[PDB]
């Protein structure tokens, strides 16, 4: 026995439920990457922006003394470089989603600017790198190796 | 987090159900969740993940899915230097750090900024950083080589089989997490998953504090391959868990003890009373369906009172004070489920923080200790009912002090608060037993506390043709300023009324409020 | 038997309550309760008594009440004695018996008789008896100088006040029983009674075996006075009680201890569970009203399942056989009570049997022993829960054996038959925590089993003004040839619908059936 | 506060409710303890007569073997002789309540023959001495000083 014929779909759309669920399709994988960008910064746009500021280590830069110790933190250990060497070995196929990714929440954020929070604003426009960056930091520096047990406080 | 497979010989329908239950903070910004669905001509994924992600971590479709919980995988090492003559001591010599002159800006309150210098310095472990009381910790961490995290995931997601989806588990990308599988093919599969360094000697309290770093016989290169870690594949109780307790009880029977395995990988610490649930609920029913799974996913019994009030409550009845003996017949006439309208559960929490501390997870008071042979009915009994009695007078007061009574409904202090939205509680702290976790903060002037963590994206599947899924997500899609999608799921939680969720495309057109087509520009 | 007296201050509305709940065979004959009503110009008693006897053992009118419980008080005591020429020895010296030629009849099957003479032989200690294995055994009985044992109950049943009935009581005329007194003025009292002898060394386990007789320094001469017995007045725990128990728990919290009386007393084995129970429901509840205190009569928990299933149920879990792993479910999803529906009853008593034995007094099954500082709390869990498994596979076996099934409803099987009347049972042995009392016999071939023993007199009193009482007696008033009266209860008993006691002369007319005027010439 | 009023009985009549329990009244306590005895010979006639017919010691004599050993139990022990001196021992007045109780007994057997069990009639007429017999033999020897203790059986 197999499963229900899955649907293919003809046209890039985004479907809002009534819960404000995004279901993305797309015609290709790219396309949809490309979506799920737009959907997420559409429903979380500024408080993405800001950790894709912390992820290339300018938080301390953007916003202050409050994001110093995680600049420091990951400045130290190199995480936006080392985001960039992953980044570009990044498999042609998959790179090519990070980047669509990317563009859908630049896309999102160039159509409806006001939507967006003014301190946050200067992040535009973001990357795939910003994103490997971001990934890297969740995974290694925050769930594996968290400045707190390292500085010991 | 709690996370629930079972195979298809364990329910009614024989179809295998999933668990999706990651329990985080409920205002940290890196750990939201977001609910979304992607369909393309090649693959299909439903499900959550953190913001910011491109890839679905708690994934499932009409084929497959997958959900996660922490595993606290040891993948970073924290060296001690012994710093001379300008370097650090290593196996008898001074080495010389790797320097490096960077530099960053600061913002000032007043909008400017100012550049600070920072110089970086390398051990041969890793990264130096300096901590307040002088010392100098060098912090290797493991995997800083493996660049295919995100399509890791991406691969097993979107795996046509398990085999594909071990192929992938296999590479080893994702650093950490346990992660559960299941099919409707009916494979249900458990993996401690994360890169770990092959360790020489030590176990992991060891490995866990700052280590030596004056000798290489501490320094590891290699990492352990999935071969090594604990893995569990449709075991013959039919069922997996895991609710963050170590992996000594995956499953029941299990499948292996810890001695199969390096004692650094995993502690063997008492698992909690919530894991202890965990493992009651999934072994002891049977003939399963999605609604009685469901059922069970929202228990919320107070399984330290189980254990602790048979001793307590006689001891308290001897006591000259009125009030304390008034006490005691209100936990007595409890039902130890931490229902709403409860009008003992909060005194009940305040005599367990004193007894078992306040994160609940104390050990000192019981009389008979946690053992690994009775993993589900141990510990128990109160140790020292005298001293347990002095501690509950106290309770009695903390309580008044927090609540205004002893006798206050749990539910009236307990809320859930959302924008507009208010309403009340149920369920409470993990490690008291309750599987349906809400970690209340503390009271307010009033009395008043509410969620700080607990039940986040919460889904229920089943494999069937087509799949059957339910889910919520407490604080809602959409944290947006002035969105309609942050406090408009927090009602349904109230009364665990779960949506449906929607992955046939005419499901789909009959729920659309909202189609925004796009354009892009490859 | 139970018994519970419960001081004003604890109930709603300020008057004493009293039960008595004695627990005889349902067949000896001897054993018989018979319930009446008596009114003199002077007096009133209401109550139950065996048959034979003229005065109301289980009596109450409307100013006081009383109750017993077998204490087995050890007022006799077998003497091993040394045969040795033509005597027995004594202090070094051979002493005479003193003989009787006697003689009885004994009837043959045919209808005559034949003379049997009989002699009777007397040491120092009293008369003696040869047993099989030729051992000579020498009976002393206490108190055989005590006439006045009918006028004694007489007289304390009619006290006009506590200090006419403790005057009463102080003549210690009855041999044996624990006593519980309640009256209108809010006085309620615990005693145990019985005629003690006053013994120079030995505890009881030495006094109730066969003492030494061929020395002076084991006869004893004299016997203790009201004032040395254990008695409770007033506690401060507002109630007294005694389900068989030794007497060291008669009330919560304790006025004494063990060590503040002879040794040879009573002893100090462990509380039943039956007992742990009556306390329990006692202490923990408060503001009692006679309905809630009826409510509480009818418990039938099955507190030995609290003890030992969270240990069994996980490790019968493991055992490849399904069918104890099915019976492990059947256990885990009881709601522990014996209840007529349950399912999962029968095979409890039965695993409970190989456990602790075919009494269900075993200790050397658990994992925590019983001990006086935890005596309602104790013995507790599984020590071998491997061997524990073992037993629950032939405790499968033995259910199917006598019921046909490992889950067939308790009171399919447990029936209440008397004469045309067959009704379902409910509540079972004291022993695994049944307040309620029915001692079921071995199943026939069908297993089908009736009550052997327990709940036969029940009576609930309130010393109101006028008093309230309610009662039942399982096995009818008379028991005569033909009578409609004996089976004519066992249906209310059933469904648990007692009667209402009445005492006041109008409530009797109005029930009245027949009646006998008489004549007695003086 | 009092108790209430207490009943007065004017004449001596035994009111059965539908249960068979009698409510008996008395112009005085020996004419209480007269219906007493009437209606436990109504109601348990048989079995209490049986009974007292052991307390003499003569239970082997009446009905043989099977009640042999309560005999020599009860004889051995000096139960029946004891009784003839405790009955002699008693009050005046509570004398004259356990012989009325005694006469209730024989009254009821005297007025309804048929209703007695034929085995059990040879027992009659019973008198006070067998009522404090039976209630020695219950109380000490057989709750305090059970044979089968003492027999070893």
């Known amino acids: 026995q197999a499963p229900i014929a899955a649907y293919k779909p003809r046209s890039n759309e985004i479907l809002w439920d009534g819960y404000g669920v995004p279901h993305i399709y797309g015609v290709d994988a790219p396309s949809a990457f490309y979506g799920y960008g737009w959907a997420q910064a559409r429903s979380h746009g500024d408080n993405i922006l800001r950790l894709y500021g912390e992820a290339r280590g300018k938080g301390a830069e ?61 992040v535009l426009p973001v990357s795939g790198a910003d994103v490997v960056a971001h990934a890297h930091r969740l995974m290694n520096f925050l769930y594996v190796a968290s400045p707190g047990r390292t500085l010991g406080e | 987090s709690n996370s629930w497979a079972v195979a298809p010989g364990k329910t009614a329908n024989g179809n295998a159900l999933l668990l999706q239950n990651p329990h985080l903070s409920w205002t940290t910004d890196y750990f939201t969740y977001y609910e979304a669905h992607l369909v393309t001509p090649d693959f299909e994924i439903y499900g959550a993940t953190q913001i910011g992600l491109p890839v679905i971590r708690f994934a499932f479709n009409q084929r497959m899915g997958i959900t996660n919980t922490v595993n606290g995988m040891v993948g970073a090492t924290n060296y001690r230097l012994t710093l001379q003559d300008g370097g650090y001591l290593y196996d008898g010599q001074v080495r010389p750090f790797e320097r490096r002159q960077a530099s960053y800006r600061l913002r000032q309150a007043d909008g400017t900024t100012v550049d600070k210098p920072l110089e970086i310095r390398s051990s041969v472990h890793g990264p130096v950083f300096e901590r307040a009381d002088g010392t100098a910790v060098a912090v290797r961490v493991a995997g800083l080589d493996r660049p295919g995290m995100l399509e890791q995931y991406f691969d ?156 307590l409550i006689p001891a308290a009845l001897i006591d000259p004070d009125p009030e304390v003996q008034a006490a005691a017949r209100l936990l007595a006439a409890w039902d130890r489920e931490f229902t709403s309208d409860s009008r003992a559960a909060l005194l009940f929490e305040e005599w367990a923080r004193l007894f078992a501390g306040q994160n609940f997870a104390g050990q000192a008071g019981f009389a008979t200790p946690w053992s690994l042979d009775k993993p589900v009915s141990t510990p128990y009994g109160v140790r020292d009912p005298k001293a347990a009695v002095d501690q509950l007078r106290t309770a009695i007061a903390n309580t008044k002090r927090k609540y205004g009574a002893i006798d206050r409904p749990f539910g009236d202090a307990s809320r859930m608060i959302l924008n507009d939205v208010n309403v009340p509680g149920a369920a409470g702290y993990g490690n008291l037993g309750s599987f349906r976790v809400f970690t209340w903060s503390d009271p307010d002037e009033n009395g008043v506390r509410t969620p700080v963590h607990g039940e986040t994206w919460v889904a229920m599947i089943e494999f069937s043709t087509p799949v059957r899924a339910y889910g919520l997500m407490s604080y809602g899609n959409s944290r947006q300023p002035g969105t309609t999608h942050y406090s408009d799921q927090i009602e349904r939680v109230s009364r665990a009324d779960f949506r449906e969720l929607l992955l046939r495309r005419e499901q789909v057109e009959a729920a659309v409020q909202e189609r925004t087509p796009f354009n892009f520009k490859p």
Do not use: C
């Not at chain 2, 249900?188 to 000697?201: C, D, L, M």
């Open chain 1, 62 to 122: 953007y916003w202050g003394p409050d994001y110093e110790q995680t600049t420091v933190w990951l400045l130290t250990n190199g995480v936006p470089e080392r985001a960039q060497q992953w980044y570009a070995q990044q498999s042609p196929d998959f790179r090519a989603n990070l980047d669509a990714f990317a563009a859908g929440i630049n896309a999102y954020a160039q159509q409806n600017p006001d939507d967006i929070s003014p301190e946050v604003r200067q």
């Open chain 2, 156 to 311: 097993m997601i979107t795996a046509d089989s398990f085999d594909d989806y071990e192929a992938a588990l296999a590479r080893m990308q994702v650093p950490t997490f346990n992660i559960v599988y299941a099919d409707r093919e009916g494979t249900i599969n458990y993996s401690f998953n994360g890169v770990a360094p092959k360790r020489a000697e030590g176990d992991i309290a060891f490995w866990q504090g700052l280590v030596p770093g004056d000798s290489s016989r501490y320094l590891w290169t290699e990492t352990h391959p999935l071969d090594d870690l604990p893995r569990v594949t449709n075991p013959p109780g039919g069922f997996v868990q895991n609710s963050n307790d170590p992996p000594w009880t995956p499953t029941w029977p299990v499948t292996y003890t810890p001695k199969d395995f390096p004692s650094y990988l995993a502690p063997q610490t008492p698992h909690s009373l919530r894991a202890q649930q965990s493992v009651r609920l999934m072994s002891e029913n049977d003939d399963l369906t999605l609604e009685r799974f469901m059922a069970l996913q929202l228990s919320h019994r107070a399984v330290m009172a189980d254990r602790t009030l048979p001793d």
